[PDB]
Amino acid sequence: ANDIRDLSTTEIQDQEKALKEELFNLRFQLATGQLENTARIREVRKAIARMKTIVRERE
Amino acid sequence: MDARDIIKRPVVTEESTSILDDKKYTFEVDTRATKTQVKYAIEEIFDVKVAKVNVMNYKGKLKRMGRYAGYTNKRRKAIVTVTADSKEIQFF
Amino acid sequence: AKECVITGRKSRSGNKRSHAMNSSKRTWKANLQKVRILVNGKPKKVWVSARALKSGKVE
Amino acid sequence: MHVKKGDKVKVITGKDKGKSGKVLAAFPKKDRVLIEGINMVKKHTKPSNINPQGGILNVEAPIHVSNVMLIDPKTGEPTRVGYEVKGDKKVRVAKKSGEVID
RNA sequence: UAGGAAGAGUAGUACUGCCCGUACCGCAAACCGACACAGGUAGAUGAGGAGAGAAUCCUAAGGUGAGCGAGAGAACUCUCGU
RNA sequence: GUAUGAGUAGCGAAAGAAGGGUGAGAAUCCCUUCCACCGAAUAUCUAAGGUUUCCUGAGGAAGGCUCGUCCGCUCAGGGUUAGUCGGGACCUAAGCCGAGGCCGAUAGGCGUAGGCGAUGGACAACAGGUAGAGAUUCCUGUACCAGUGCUAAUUGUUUAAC
RNA sequence: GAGCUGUACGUAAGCGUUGAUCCAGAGAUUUCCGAAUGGGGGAACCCACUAUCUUUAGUCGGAUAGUAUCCUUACGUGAAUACAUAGCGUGAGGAAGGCAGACCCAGGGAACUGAAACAUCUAAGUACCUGGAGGAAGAGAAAGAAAAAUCGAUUUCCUGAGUAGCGGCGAGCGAAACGGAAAGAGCCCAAACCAAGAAGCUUGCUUCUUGGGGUUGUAGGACACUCUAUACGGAGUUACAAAAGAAAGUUAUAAAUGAAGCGGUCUGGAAAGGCCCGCCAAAGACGGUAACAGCCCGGUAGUUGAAAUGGCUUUCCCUCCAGAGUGGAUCCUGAGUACGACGGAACACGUGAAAUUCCGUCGGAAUCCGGGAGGACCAUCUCCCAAGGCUAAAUACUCCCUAGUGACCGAUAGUGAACCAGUACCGUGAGGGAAAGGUGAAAAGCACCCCGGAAGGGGAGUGAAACAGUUCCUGAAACCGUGUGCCUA
Ligand SMILES: [Mg+2]
Ligand SMILES: [Mg+2]
Ligand SMILES: [Mg+2]
Ligand SMILES: [Mg+2]
Ligand SMILES: [Mg+2]
Ligand SMILES: [Mg+2]
Ligand SMILES: [Mg+2]
Ligand SMILES: [Mg+2]
Ligand SMILES: [Mg+2]
Ligand SMILES: [Mg+2]
Ligand SMILES: [Mg+2]
Ligand SMILES: [Mg+2]
Ligand SMILES: [Mg+2]
Ligand SMILES: [Mg+2]
Ligand SMILES: [Mg+2]
Ligand SMILES: [Mg+2]
């Protein structure tokens, strides 16, 4: 959480896009059927939400 | 709606696997996605170029689990055909 | 609206008794003639009660 | 609860009164405690994924928390438990003879 | 015609073209009659022989053998023939 | 809730027969042959309506006026592809709503501009193929309608092509 | 402070003493329909315009903001029509709808029934429709009540009293004041008059606004007189004018600590039960634990606790303010109103001898030597100043939240609903509207053998009980069977 608030509100969007790409790949692999570490979906969703909340509260 | 957001997940059955050979891939999309938003989203994600897209709406099936009845989700199925010269989405 | 704009008098309700005092429900309307007066600085045409018009208002 | 994972326990009431052991689980939702070597039961199970031979299985079964008294490693007797703040944290205290349980 | 007016068409190339319905029954066991009900349900095509004919009898393409049976051949009731 | 009527009425128009097969179990399920019925229909399409009843693999408790290895029944997986077909992004009739407005104890009634509203008007794709389910939609040939860009000449500039 | 990923068994994958799951206060996101408000519409759907940015070689596509109507207001344009008005556009505030099936104010307003028929009358200004609300609403500071003497705004309660009265004088309707209580609070305009302006110049004026004065009946005010007084003081956002900022205390929304028996002993599946002994208590409330627990658990009495937000109280702050006596020449104190005639309604009062209040139409005063009332009316007396307005408390009701209570029910009862109930089902629709609780302390929920295709059984086993086996405590009666002692063609 507090590991994020020390970033210049620009690279966090880059991390957000990267996390979105990783989440989509994980969902795609689960749909195919070759995924086992299913906790990654929740982990990435929570991370994206945290960074979105930091963006919104920055103003 | 984000490009990652429009495309939900592939549909892997016997029919879709049988059609993958002819450069046709079957996906799920947002219930509110046009036939051209999907085309541009696929071009953006998988880095190919698309010839045609065909969409179709599926209603909700009726299921029961013991004294309790409800309808499954509502799907929006799409089929992307890719041009003569471009990469092939893996699926695997 | 059928109501005098100067004094707000309208239709009311009451009985119409006969001999032997049978009660029938009637109404008392009011004299509302249509005239042209100065509702605001600019003149217009509105309802004015005859009694309220007997002295004081211009036409 | 007043009894957590890993303690030493002397049961006091039931078919299996008077014995002692450790605790291997606790279910705060149901107020039950699983104590090894206490309240052993027989399970008739078919062959399956684990235990692929079935047979009669002998395992424990949870018991209510009220049937449990803590046992002190410094003294060694069933005692009621109090609390004290040592340093800047609260610790449990054997409120029978006064020794700090931890 | 009023009006706009520095762009215009021409030929050839390649590219672009959204949303909803799209299964199935549809003179029926899936629609309207509480039913796997002798009832009702708009429109298009609707062959041959004899015939004026979409009448009538037997047939083609096509479709069915009707969701209780077998066996005796009394009275009586119903539909029929002398 | 359970009896008597009682193992009684009924089993809802119609031609079936035999030989093989599966199956614990076959008049009732699958195949073959013979026979029979409709044929301006009991045939082939498509509207309204219904809403998964459609296909594959399993099942036989309940439903099926009997039986059932079967099914429009139970369980799990699947299945509907459009610039050209029908309807919107085009148009209006009956009718409906209706800015201002007229009328009226309250509520509201009527109505102008305007807008909705097909059962009608307008408008460019045909023939084939596909053994589990889609076909003027997918695929192979050949086409047409509207628009954009780009190459090539052509043409005009306010007594002004368009 | 040690487990957790809901119901709900699970499998899988994971996270936790760097402090998870959970609990409370405050924040961000909040698709689409719905007043729905860019246009349209058959609910959750279709289709845009204007700006800004973005993508492609371009068409195609994507994000962000705005765009309904009405009322009040400012400005700009502006018709027949010359000036202007109507209209048109932009800008700023406000409204719309919901409900808590309760409470209450207004507009409108029945019949069944009773009278042993029925029309006056009652039922009833009830049910119902519509509008406006507020946490309460309505009423309220005497043109009053009352009589040999006086009171002193309004409301609610006890008596007055089923009295005085109304009444096809039938059925029936039914007061008030005096007395005793709860609660108590008073004020602000108009009018003369002073000053200012602007406008009409109705033109030496009038008429409109602003500021100041001033509001009462033993008359008051204006106007002239003196006295004190401008922050000396008083006052306040609940009326009396209104808008903010604080500090302290206190409270509401999470919690902490909290004494005393593992006592022995018999029965039992198990002790909280019996017997014999001890202890705490400001704690012997309630619930749970293998049966009935002050001393086993959560707890209770008592004592502590708030980082954040809301409520409340005292104070600071802030803001606003002339009140005494005497003359009382001249002026003022609510105009188409008060009353009256006609026709209705409410007052307990049905037009009657009918005061009192309101409505519709007509007629229509005085004005301080004046005006009104004391149940027709006149004279005398007594009391009081209408035709402008505001106002807390004592009162009514509970959709709700916290803590509790019951000589209230216990599954045909109690809500329709103890269970995925306004559900299943019925109807085109408004609408109507059920049935359905209990294994065991703990799933320990019957491994294994035999008959069968299964279902179901018979052994074995868990269990105190399997005649407790996934409608599973208890299991009555009607009803259906097998055996048999006595009688029966
Ligand atoms: Mg079809
Ligand atoms: Mg013929
Ligand atoms: Mg014929
Ligand atoms: Mg008989
Ligand atoms: Mg017979
Ligand atoms: Mg039959
Ligand atoms: Mg024939
Ligand atoms: Mg089928
Ligand atoms: Mg059967
Ligand atoms: Mg809208
Ligand atoms: Mg009567
Ligand atoms: Mg009030
Ligand atoms: Mg017991
Ligand atoms: Mg007065
Ligand atoms: Mg009940
Ligand atoms: Mg005899």
mmCIF file with all atom_site columns, C-alpha atoms in Angstrom, chain C residues 27-58:
data_model
loop_
_atom_site.group_PDB
_atom_site.id
_atom_site.type_symbol
_atom_site.label_atom_id
_atom_site.label_alt_id
_atom_site.label_comp_id
_atom_site.label_asym_id
_atom_site.label_entity_id
_atom_site.label_seq_id
_atom_site.pdbx_PDB_ins_code
_atom_site.Cartn_x
_atom_site.Cartn_y
_atom_site.Cartn_z
_atom_site.occupancy
_atom_site.B_iso_or_equiv
_atom_site.pdbx_formal_charge
_atom_site.auth_seq_id
_atom_site.auth_comp_id
_atom_site.auth_asym_id
_atom_site.auth_atom_id
_atom_site.pdbx_PDB_model_num
ATOM 1  C CA . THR C 1 27 ? -72.909 25.199 -5.779  1.00 0.00 ? 27 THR C CA 1
ATOM 2  C CA . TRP C 1 28 ? -72.601 28.970 -5.435  1.00 0.00 ? 28 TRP C CA 1
ATOM 3  C CA . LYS C 1 29 ? -70.504 30.469 -8.215  1.00 0.00 ? 29 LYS C CA 1
ATOM 4  C CA . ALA C 1 30 ? -69.405 34.106 -8.344  1.00 0.00 ? 30 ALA C CA 1
ATOM 5  C CA . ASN C 1 31 ? -69.688 36.982 -10.798 1.00 0.00 ? 31 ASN C CA 1
ATOM 6  C CA . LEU C 1 32 ? -66.464 36.722 -12.803 1.00 0.00 ? 32 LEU C CA 1
ATOM 7  C CA . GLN C 1 33 ? -66.649 38.917 -15.884 1.00 0.00 ? 33 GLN C CA 1
ATOM 8  C CA . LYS C 1 34 ? -63.755 38.937 -18.342 1.00 0.00 ? 34 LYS C CA 1
ATOM 9  C CA . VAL C 1 35 ? -62.053 42.347 -18.497 1.00 0.00 ? 35 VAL C CA 1
ATOM 10 C CA . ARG C 1 36 ? -58.751 43.865 -19.605 1.00 0.00 ? 36 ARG C CA 1
ATOM 11 C CA . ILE C 1 37 ? -56.603 45.366 -16.836 1.00 0.00 ? 37 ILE C CA 1
ATOM 12 C CA . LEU C 1 38 ? -52.947 45.895 -15.883 1.00 0.00 ? 38 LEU C CA 1
ATOM 13 C CA . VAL C 1 39 ? -51.873 42.624 -14.277 1.00 0.00 ? 39 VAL C CA 1
ATOM 14 C CA . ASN C 1 40 ? -48.304 43.913 -14.507 1.00 0.00 ? 40 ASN C CA 1
ATOM 15 C CA . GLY C 1 41 ? -46.945 47.092 -16.067 1.00 0.00 ? 41 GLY C CA 1
ATOM 16 C CA . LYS C 1 42 ? -48.187 45.681 -19.397 1.00 0.00 ? 42 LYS C CA 1
ATOM 17 C CA . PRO C 1 43 ? -51.966 45.199 -19.717 1.00 0.00 ? 43 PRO C CA 1
ATOM 18 C CA . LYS C 1 44 ? -53.678 41.835 -20.096 1.00 0.00 ? 44 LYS C CA 1
ATOM 19 C CA . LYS C 1 45 ? -57.120 40.212 -19.933 1.00 0.00 ? 45 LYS C CA 1
ATOM 20 C CA . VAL C 1 46 ? -58.084 38.288 -16.786 1.00 0.00 ? 46 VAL C CA 1
ATOM 21 C CA . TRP C 1 47 ? -61.074 37.433 -14.613 1.00 0.00 ? 47 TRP C CA 1
ATOM 22 C CA . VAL C 1 48 ? -62.256 40.121 -12.190 1.00 0.00 ? 48 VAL C CA 1
ATOM 23 C CA . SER C 1 49 ? -65.184 39.791 -9.813  1.00 0.00 ? 49 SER C CA 1
ATOM 24 C CA . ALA C 1 50 ? -68.031 42.206 -10.451 1.00 0.00 ? 50 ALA C CA 1
ATOM 25 C CA . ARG C 1 51 ? -68.150 43.351 -6.831  1.00 0.00 ? 51 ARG C CA 1
ATOM 26 C CA . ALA C 1 52 ? -64.405 43.959 -6.686  1.00 0.00 ? 52 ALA C CA 1
ATOM 27 C CA . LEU C 1 53 ? -64.812 45.994 -9.884  1.00 0.00 ? 53 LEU C CA 1
ATOM 28 C CA . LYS C 1 54 ? -67.525 48.332 -8.597  1.00 0.00 ? 54 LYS C CA 1
ATOM 29 C CA . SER C 1 55 ? -64.927 50.942 -7.579  1.00 0.00 ? 55 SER C CA 1
ATOM 30 C CA . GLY C 1 56 ? -61.145 51.259 -7.737  1.00 0.00 ? 56 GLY C CA 1
ATOM 31 C CA . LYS C 1 57 ? -59.746 49.369 -10.738 1.00 0.00 ? 57 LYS C CA 1
ATOM 32 C CA . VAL C 1 58 ? -59.027 50.870 -14.143 1.00 0.00 ? 58 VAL C CA 1
#
